[PDB]
Symmetry: C2
Subunit: 378 residues, 2 copies
C-alpha cells in the first residue's frame, strides 16, 4: 500500500548479486585515477576468456550494445534486410534489429521449452535473411547442432549462409553438449546487467568465432578509433565507424569481484531448479517445461505453464511470491504493429506462462514455501 | 628526463567513492532515485526542467536523433567535420546522410554562412558543436532556420553538442535554454564527469515525455511489466543512466564550478599574455557569450616546429581529433571545405584546465613566446 505490504515478508523474482569485495575493487580503480577503458577491462576479458575457452572476447558497455555491435559486424548486402527472431524475448533483442535498420520476421515458439521453434525457423529463412538471433531464453540453450544443420541446408539451397547471433543474456555459465556457450561458431552476447548472473552494474561481452571479426570488434566498440594510435597528431583512420560500445574500468572492476562468487550462485540456481523439478511433478493444472539433458542451462527464472493463471497469480501474491512475465511478447507492441504474423505456438501458451523465483537468494525455507503454495492448489 | 603537462585530465571529487559506497549499501545499482536526484540538481543549474540523463554523450545524441519526427526522405543531417567523431558517427548510426558544413577560421566553429547555403529540401536536422567550449552564434542560427521555415513549411531540428561546454552561456542564458535539444557529456575527461554519462535537454514537454520512455527501450518503468501491461509506442535502446554513475556526478557537482572557474581563469591569462607573438594567431572570441575552454585553441605558423617545441618543453599539445571527413569510412562524403583547409595545418590545442598550477601556465607562455 504505497509504503508498506501486508504484515511481513516477500520473495523477489530478480535480484542483484554484489560481492562484498566489489567496493574494494572499485576503490582501487578510483585510486588509479583512470575511470575509462584501462588495464582492469583487460584483466576482466582475460578472466572471461579463460573460463569460456574462447580467446576472442570483447567487453562492451551492455548486452544491448553487444547485440548492436554484432549486427554491425555483419557484412552482407543491403537487400538482405530480414532478421529472424522470436517475439518472446526481452525487447532489447528485437529493438537492436530495428536500430540496425533491418526488418523483423517473427519466428514462433516451441511450447515445450518456450524457446524458438526451429521448425518454424527453417520455414521462414528466405533469400532476404540477413541473420538469425536465437535467444537461450531464461537460461536454456537452444539446440545449436540442429540449428547448424538447418543453416547447412539453407546454404546449400540459395548461396548465402545466414549469420547466427546467440543472445546469452540469461545463459551465463550454460553449456551445450559439454561445450560452454560462446564456443559453437556463432557470435554470442552475454549480459552483465544488474539482475544477471555475473553483473558489472551494467556490462556485456561479445565473443567472436573468428579473428577477423574479433579485430573489427575491438575497433568498432570505440568509434572505430585505434586507442593506441597517436591521436594527438591525428594519426589514425576510421575504416568502419562505431559508437561508444566499450566497457570502462569502473564496471570491469565490479565484474572482477563478482567472478569470485558467480559459480556458487549459479550452482544454487540450478540446485533450486532441480528441487522444483522434483517436487512439482504431477501437480494438477501445472505443466512443467521439457528440458533436454544434452545441455545445461542457467535458470535465470523458473518457467512453468499454468491453468487458471489469474487465480495462480492471486495465489502467489497472497503467498508473497513474485511471479509473472519477464517481458510482454514483443510483437504486440504498437510500434511493430505492421510486422504481425500468425504465431500459433505462442498463441497457445502466452496465457499460461509464468516465471518463478529460483535464484541464489532463495533460502531452503523459501523454495519450500513456493512448492508448498503451489501444491496447495489455486 | 622528468615532468609533463597534460592536455586532458580526470576530475574526481574525494567524496565520490563515498557516494558510490552509499549506493552499494542501497542494494540497487540500476536507474533509481540517485539518477532522479542528479537530474533535479542539473535542472536547477540549467534552469531547464526538461532534462533527461543518458548513459553517455553519444547516447544522448543518438537518442536526440531518434526523437526527430520527419519523413524518411529528408535524409540529410548537416554537420561540420571538425568535431569529435562521436558527433558524426551518431548520424551514420541513425542511418542518415552527412553533408559537411565548413568551419569559420576565426572561431573554429561551424561556418553559419556555409550552413545557410547548404540547407536543402533533404535537410532533416543540423548538429552544431560548441567546439572546445565556445558557444555558436545561436541567435543567428535561429534566424537561418526561422527563414527556412517561413519559406517552405519544415523547420529542420537543431541538436547542440555541448560535450565541451558544460557551464557555458550565450547572451546571459545557460546552454540548454535556447529552444534546441542539447546534449551534455559527463565522460571521464569532461568538466562534470560521472565516470561516463550525459544529459539530454529538451525544449518542449512532448519531446521530454518521449525521451524518458525511449531512453529505456520505450518501456514505462512504472508500468506493470510483470503482468505484461505496458506498450512500446516507439522503440529505444539502453540509453539511460544508472544510479551507479549518477552518484559520481553528484559528488563532482560539488567541485565542478571551481574547476570551471580555473579553466576560464587560465584561458584569460593566455588571452592576455600571448598577444603579439610572431607566428601565433589567437582566436577571436565574442563577448556576448561565456565559454568553457575544454582546451585552449590557437593557430600557429610552422606548426611542426611548434609541436617539437612543446614536446621538448614537456607540454602535451595537439588535436582533439582528426577532421572527420578524412576518414576512409566517409570517403564517399568528401566535399570541398576551404575554411577548414586553411586552419587545419595551423591548429593546435593547449592545456588550460584546472590542473595547471600558476607555475605551469607561466611555463607554457614562456615556452611559446621564446619562439620556435
Amino acid at each position: 500500500s504505497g509504503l508498506v505490504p501486508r504484515g511481513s515478508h516477500m520473495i523477489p523474482l530478480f535480484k542483484v548479486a554484489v560481492s562484498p569485495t566489489a567496493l574494494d575493487r572499485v576503490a582501487e580503480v578510483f585510486a588509479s585515477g583512470y575511470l575509462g577503458q584501462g588495464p582492469r577491462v583487460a584483466e576482466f576479458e582475460s578472466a572471461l576468456a579463460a573460463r569460456l575457452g574462447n580467446p576472442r572476447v570483447v567487453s562492451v558497455h551492455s548486452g544491448t550494445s553487444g547485440l548492436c555491435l554484432a549486427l554491425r559486424l555483419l557484412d552482407a548486402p543491403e537487400e538482405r534486410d530480414e532478421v529472424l527472431s522470436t517475439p518472446l524475448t526481452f525487447e532489447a533483442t528485437n529493438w537492436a534489429i530495428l536500430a540496425d535498420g533491418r526488418r523483423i520476421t517473427w519466428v514462433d515458439v516451441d511450447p515445450a521449452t518456450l524457446t524458438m521453434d526451429l521448425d518454424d525457423l527453417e520455414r521462414k529463412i528466405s533469400p532476404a535473411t540477413r541473420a538469425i538471433i536465437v535467444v537461450h531464453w531464461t537460461g536454456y540453450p537452444v539446440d545449436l547442432d540442429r540449428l547448424a544443420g538447418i543453416l547447412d541446408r539453407a546454404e546449400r539451397e540459395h548461396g548465402f549462409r545466414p549469420a547466427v547471433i546467440e543472445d546469452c543474456a540469461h545463459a551465463w555459465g550454460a553449456s551445450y553438449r559439454g561445450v560452454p556457450l560462446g564456443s559453437h561458431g556463432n557470435m554470442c552476447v552475454f549480459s552483465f546487467q544488474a539482475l544477471k548472473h555475473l553483473t558489472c552494474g551494467d556490462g556485456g561481452l561479445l565473443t567472436l568465432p573468428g579473428d577477423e571479426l574479433h579485430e573489427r570488434a575491438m575497433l568498432r566498440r570505440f568509434y572505430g578509433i585505434d586507442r593506441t594510435a597517436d591521436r594527438l597528431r591525428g594519426a589514425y583512420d576510421v575504416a568502419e565507424w562505431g559508437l561508444k560500445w566499450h566497457m570502462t574500468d569502473l564496471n570491469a572492476a565490479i565484474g572482477l569481484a563478482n567472478l569470485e562468487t558467480v559459480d556458487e550462485q549459479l550452482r544454487l540456481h540450478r540446485e533450486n531448479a532441480a528441487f522444483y523439478d522434483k517436487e512439482l511433478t504431477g501437480v494438477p493444472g501445472l505443466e512443467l517445461l521439457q528440458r533436454s539433458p544434452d545441455r545445461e542451462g542457467s535458470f535465470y527464472v523458473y518457467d512453468v505453464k499454468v491453468d487458471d493463471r489469474p487465480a495462480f497469480h492471486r495465489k502467489m501474491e497472497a503467498a508473497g511470491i513474485m511471479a509473472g512475465l519477464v517481458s510482454r511478447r514483443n510483437d504486440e507492441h504498437s510500434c511493430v504493429a505492421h510486422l504481425r504474423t500468425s504465431l500459433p505456438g505462442l498463441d497457445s501458451v502466452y496465457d499460461r506462462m509464468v516465471s518463478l523465483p529460483v535464484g541464489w537468494w532463495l533460502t531452503e525455507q523459501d523454495r519450500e514455501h513456493v512448492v508448498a503454495t503451489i501444491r496447495s492448489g489455486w
